[PDB]
Amino acid sequence: TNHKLIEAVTKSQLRTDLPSFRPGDTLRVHVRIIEGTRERIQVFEGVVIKRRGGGVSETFTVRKISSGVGVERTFPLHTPKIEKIEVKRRGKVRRAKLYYLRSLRGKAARIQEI
Amino acid sequence: TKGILGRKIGMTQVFGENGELIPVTVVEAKENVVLQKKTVEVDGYNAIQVGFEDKKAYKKDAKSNKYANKPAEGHAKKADAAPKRFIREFRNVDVDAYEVGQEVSVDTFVAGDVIDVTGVSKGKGFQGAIKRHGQSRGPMSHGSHFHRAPGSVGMASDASRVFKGQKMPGRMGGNTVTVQNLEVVQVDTENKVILVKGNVPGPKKGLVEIRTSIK
Amino acid sequence: YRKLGRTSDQRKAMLRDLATSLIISERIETTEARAKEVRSVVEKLITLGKKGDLASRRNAAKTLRNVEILNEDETTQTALQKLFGEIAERYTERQGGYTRILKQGPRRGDGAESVIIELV
Amino acid sequence: AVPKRRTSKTRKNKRRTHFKISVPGMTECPNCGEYKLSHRVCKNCGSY
Amino acid sequence: MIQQETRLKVADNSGAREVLTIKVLGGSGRKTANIGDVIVCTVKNATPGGVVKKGDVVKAVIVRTKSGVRRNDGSYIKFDENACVIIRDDKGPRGTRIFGPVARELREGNFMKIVSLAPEVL
RNA sequence: UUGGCACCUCGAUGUCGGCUCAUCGCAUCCUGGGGCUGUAGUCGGUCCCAAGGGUUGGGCUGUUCGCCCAUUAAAGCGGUACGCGAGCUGGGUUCAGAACGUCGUGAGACAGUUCGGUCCCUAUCCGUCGUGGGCGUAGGAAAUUUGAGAGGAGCUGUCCUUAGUACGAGAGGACCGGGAUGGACAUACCUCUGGUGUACCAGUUGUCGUGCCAACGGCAUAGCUGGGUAGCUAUGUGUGGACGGGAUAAGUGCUGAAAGCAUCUAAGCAUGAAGCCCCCCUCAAGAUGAGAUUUCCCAACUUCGGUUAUAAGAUCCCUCAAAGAUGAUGAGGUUAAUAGGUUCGAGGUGGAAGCAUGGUGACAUGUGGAGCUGACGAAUACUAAUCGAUCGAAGACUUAAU
C-alpha cells in the first residue's frame, strides 16, 4: 500500500484546532515567539492572500501594512508555533490568489465583508 | 552495523522540538530478510545479503520479472523465504548476528542515528555541457553564435589530441550516489517506514540502501 | 499525452474531427498514434452521452463538429443527436471500453502502422 | 568537413555490417489464409 | 537577494534617501545579501543637511529585503521594498530615527541598537 | 622580452585582444611545516620544505598593459602556434569611401589621426564524451560480489572560550587548545519558497459561425488577462570537505664512534606538513591473468561428421515508464492491474449550466465549495497486452593428489 504512507505517517502531527478560512478573510494570527527569556506571543493581523497545496504542508499567507510598508508573512498551517487563529472579518473576493493587492496601496486594496 | 533496504515513497515534512520544520523522505523498508551469510572462510570477506521485496513464485510460462525463475527459487529456498526482487550485500554489519532467514525489521534504527543512503540518480537522458556540467554559457547577444556549446576542447598542437576527462555532453544518467550523515527522525513500526531527514537520490518507488555512517 | 506532430490547435482540430467521424461511421481507419489519442477522446464523449442531461449536452458540443448523418428513410440527425441517442443506448450497462484498436500492416507511402479503431 | 582519405572497400564493408534488416513477425492465421504479421489483423488473403 | 548596483531606500535619518551597493562584504565571491548582512554602498539621493552627503561611501546593514528570509519553523517574511540603515562601523547606526518595520533576524547579529530605535519588529 | 640568424611553410602554417573550456611548470600569492632575526607580545623580516586546493568584482582604455574604486586568507608568475576562431565575437589592425594635420609641383604618401566597412565548411580518420552489437573467459544459465586498477574529491574565513591570561613600563596582546558558525565549491532532491507548466480552471476584446435568445465554437502570439497539478527546475531545500592511520620533506633530536674529545649519522634510534600512501566517494575480471560465492539445467540419433530437437534460460512480438536519440534499462503480457476507459479521490480553479428570486436595467442572490479538471492516488478486467515463433548446454586434454 503506497498511497496511505504519505498520509498515515504524517497524520499525528496535523492539527484540528484551527478555524475555517479562505483568501480574502482577515485573520488575527497568534504566533508565539521564544527568545532566551520567555515564550512571548505576538499577534499578526492581516488579510489572507494565498492558501496552497494540501497535507501537513498546507501553507497560508497573510498581508499587513506596518509603517507604510506592506509585510507578507507565510506560515505552515499545522505548525505548533501558532497558538490561535481568529477570523476577524470575512471577505468578498473572486480569486483564490490575491496577488493584485501587492501593487494596490491605500484604499484601493480594500476587501469587502461576507 | 544496521543496514536495511527500502524504496522511496516520496517527501513530506515534520515539526520537531520548538516547532522546527524539518524535511523528510519516507522510505518503506518493508519485508527485508537475511538471505545469505558470507564468510571469509568461503569467500574472503564477511557480509550478509538482504533481499528486499518479495515477488511471486515460479510460473511455467512467465514472461516478465515479477515471477521468479528457478535459480531465484532455489536461492531463496536455502533460507526459508519468498523470492525477493532486490538483493544487496551489507558488509559493514556484524556477521555474527543475523541468522539466515531473519526478518530484519524497521526497528534496527532509533530516531537520531546518522546514516548513509545509497541510490541511483534520476536520469535525465542525453544532456549538453552546460546542463551535464556546470558550464558558463556564451553571450546571448552582441553578435555571438556561441551559446550552449562546450568551449575549446584542447590546446593547438602541443597536445594535438583531446585529453580525457574533457567534460563533453552525453548521458546525465542515473548512477549510484550516496548522501552522507543524514538523520533518522521517526520510525513507524506498524507502517514499516523510516523518515530520513532530507532528500535521497532516485525517483519515487526506487531503491535505497540505508546503512549507518562510516564517519 | 502525444503531440502527433502538430500545433496545440492543429492537434485539437484534428482530434475532434477524428472523433466525430468515429461517431458517424463507427469504425475508421487511421494511424496507430492518432488512434491511441482519439481513443481517450471519444470514450470521454460517450461518458457524456450516458449522462444525457442538458449540462453535458453542452459539453459534448464543445468537441463534436457540426456533421449531419443521413440516416435510413431519409431522416437526418446530427452527430450530437446520434451520440446521445444511439451510442448512449448501446453502452448503458458497460463501464468502460467503448472502443477497440485492431492493428494492421504498414502503409505503402510510409511505414505508418495502419489501425482500424472500432466502436465497441 | 571533407574526407582526408578515401575509405577502402574493406573499411566500407566493415561499417555497414550493422546496416541490415530483420525478418518480420510471420505468425500463421489459424482461421484462414497465409502468414500475418504478429499482433496484426489481416486485410487481404487471410481471415484475421 | 541584494547584489552589486541595487538601489535601496535608506531607512533612517542618517542623511540618505537612496543608496546603491558596491560590494557585499563577507567572503570572496559573495554575490547576494539578505537581512543582517552588511553592505558597502554609495548614497545617490541624499537629504540636504544631515550627516552623509551624495557621493560618500558608507557601510550599511540590510533591513527588510523584498525577497525576505526563512525561519527555522518554516515561516517566511517578505516586504514591499528593499531598505537599509547606514551604520557606524561598530554595528551601531548613524541616525536615531529608524523608519519602517525591521525583520527579527538581525537581533542575533548584534544590531540591538537598530532594533531599539525602530518600529514594531516582525 | 627585445633582438640576431634565415632552417620549415608564399600551388596559404590565416587574424591582436576578449569570450568559452582548460591544462602544465614552481623561481610559492594565500593556506601547511621549519631556521634565523637588529623575533617582548602583537606584527613582521628573511630563508628553507611543499603544486593539495584556492587565487574577486567594478571604473577608464580596442587595448595587452596600466591606473583607480571596492573587497579578499590571498587577489602568484610562467608554458601550452604570445593555449584555444573547421569553439564564439571582430573593438584593435593591411582593403576599397571620406576628412584633418603633415609631406610632395603632382598623382599621392604617412604608419599621424578620425568616421564607415561581408568572419566559408553537411566531421572521413585520429582523439574525446556517451552508448549498443559480436566473440572470448573449456558445460550452459540466473543472481550477488572481490578489487588489480582508474577517476573524483582535497579551499578557507569569522566569532566565542581558554584569557585580558602569557608578554609588556604602558599601550597593547598571544601560542596551544577547545567550541560555534560562514564564504566559495561540489552534489542530491522538489517537502517548503519560487519559476515554468501551449490537452487545467476562470475573466475578457474584436469578428465569423452553430436559424435566433441563452449557451458555446473558430481565428486574432496560447487573442489577451488571472491563476495553476504532474514533470523539469534554483535563486529553494538537504548533505559534503572531515577526521584518523602509516611513510616522509625541510627541520628537530637521542645514542654513537670513526677522530680517547666533540659529533643528528657513519652503524642505530626517534620526531616531524594542507604534501605522499591509505582512510572517503564513484567506476571497474575484455584484470585475454578474463576472479569468487549461491542457485538452476543435464541428448539422443549418431562416418556423433553433424543433424534433429530441446533444458535451465532467454528473445521476437505486444501493453508501458522510475528509462530513454536509437537501441539498451526497468514495469507488464490473461493464473494479467501493463496502459487506456470507468468509478472514487488528491491537488487546481473559485461558485457551472439550467432554474428561481430581486432589480426598469446592466446585473445580483439562491439552488450549491458548485461545476470542471492533462500527466497524481486507489479500485475495477470494460478495451487492448492474441495465437504463436526463434535462440539456447551436453561439459577437451595433460599431470598431480584423491
Curated annotation (Swiss-Prot), chain A:
Molecular function per GO: structural constituent of ribosome
A Pfam family of this chain: Ribosomal_L19
CC terms in the record's Gene Ontology section: cytosolic large ribosomal subunit
Keywords: Ribonucleoprotein, Ribosomal protein
InterPro entries in UniProt: Ribosomal_bL19, Ribosomal_bL19_CS, Ribosomal_bL19_sf, Translation_prot_SH3-like_sf
Disulphide linkage map: none
GO BP: translation
TM ranges: none
Family per similarity comment: Belongs to the bacterial ribosomal protein bL19 family.
Protein role: This protein is located at the 30S-50S ribosomal subunit interface and may play a role in the structure and function of the aminoacyl-tRNA binding site.
Protein name: Large ribosomal subunit protein bL19
Organism per entry: Staphylococcus aureus (strain bovine RF122 / ET3-1)
Higher taxonomy: Bacteria, Bacillati, Bacillota, Bacilli, Bacillales
From Swiss-Prot, chain B:
Keyword Transmembrane helix in annotation: no
Gene Ontology cellular component terms for the protein in this record: cytosolic large ribosomal subunit
Keywords: Ribonucleoprotein, Ribosomal protein, RNA-binding, rRNA-binding
Pfam families per the UniProt record, alphabetical: Ribosomal_L3 (PF00297)
Top-level taxon of origin: Bacteria
Transmembrane feature ranges: none
GO annotation, biological process: translation
Gene3D superfamilies associated with the record: 3.30.160.810, Translation factors
Disordered: annotated span: 129-155
One Gene Ontology molecular-function label: structural constituent of ribosome
Binding partners and assembly: Part of the 50S ribosomal subunit. Forms a cluster with proteins L14 and L19.
UniProt cross-references to NCBIfam families, sorted A to Z: L3_bact
Job of this protein: One of the primary rRNA binding proteins, it binds directly near the 3'-end of the 23S rRNA, where it nucleates assembly of the 50S subunit.
HAMAP family: Ribosomal_uL3_B
The family this protein is said to belong to: Belongs to the universal ribosomal protein uL3 family.
UniProt protein name: Large ribosomal subunit protein uL3
Organism: Staphylococcus aureus (strain bovine RF122 / ET3-1)
Curated annotation (Swiss-Prot), chain C:
An example molecular function term from Gene Ontology annotations: structural constituent of ribosome
Gene3D superfamilies from the UniProt entry: Ribosomal protein L17
InterPro entries in the record: Ribosomal_bL17, Ribosomal_bL17_CS, Ribosomal_bL17_sf
GO process terms (BP): translation
Keyword check for Ribonucleoprotein: yes
Keywords from the named record: Ribonucleoprotein, Ribosomal protein
Keyword Ribosomal protein: yes
Entry GO terms, CC: cytosolic large ribosomal subunit
Top-level taxon of origin: Bacteria
NCBIfam families in the record: L17 (TIGR00059)
Assembly description: Part of the 50S ribosomal subunit. Contacts protein L32.
PANTHER family with a match to the protein in the record: LARGE RIBOSOMAL SUBUNIT PROTEIN BL17M (PTHR14413:SF16), RIBOSOMAL PROTEIN L17 (PTHR14413)
Protein family (similarity comment): Belongs to the bacterial ribosomal protein bL17 family.
Protein name: Large ribosomal subunit protein bL17
Natural source organism: Staphylococcus aureus (strain bovine RF122 / ET3-1)
Phylogenetic placement of the source organism: Bacteria, Bacillati, Bacillota, Bacilli, Bacillales
From Swiss-Prot, chain E:
UniProt cross-references to SMART domains, sorted A to Z: Ribosomal_L14
Cystine crosslinks: none
Gene Ontology BP term (one): translation
A Pfam entry, by short name: Ribosomal_L14
Example of a GO MF term: structural constituent of ribosome
Keywords: Ribonucleoprotein, Ribosomal protein, RNA-binding, rRNA-binding
GO cellular component: cytosolic large ribosomal subunit
Cross-referenced SUPFAM superfamilies: Ribosomal protein L14
Protein purpose: Binds to 23S rRNA. Forms part of two intersubunit bridges in the 70S ribosome.
Family stated for the protein in its record: Belongs to the universal ribosomal protein uL14 family.
Quaternary structure and partners: Part of the 50S ribosomal subunit. Forms a cluster with proteins L3 and L19. In the 70S ribosome, L14 and L19 interact and together make contacts with the 16S rRNA in bridges B5 and B8.
Protein's UniProt name: Large ribosomal subunit protein uL14
Gene from which the chain derives: rplN
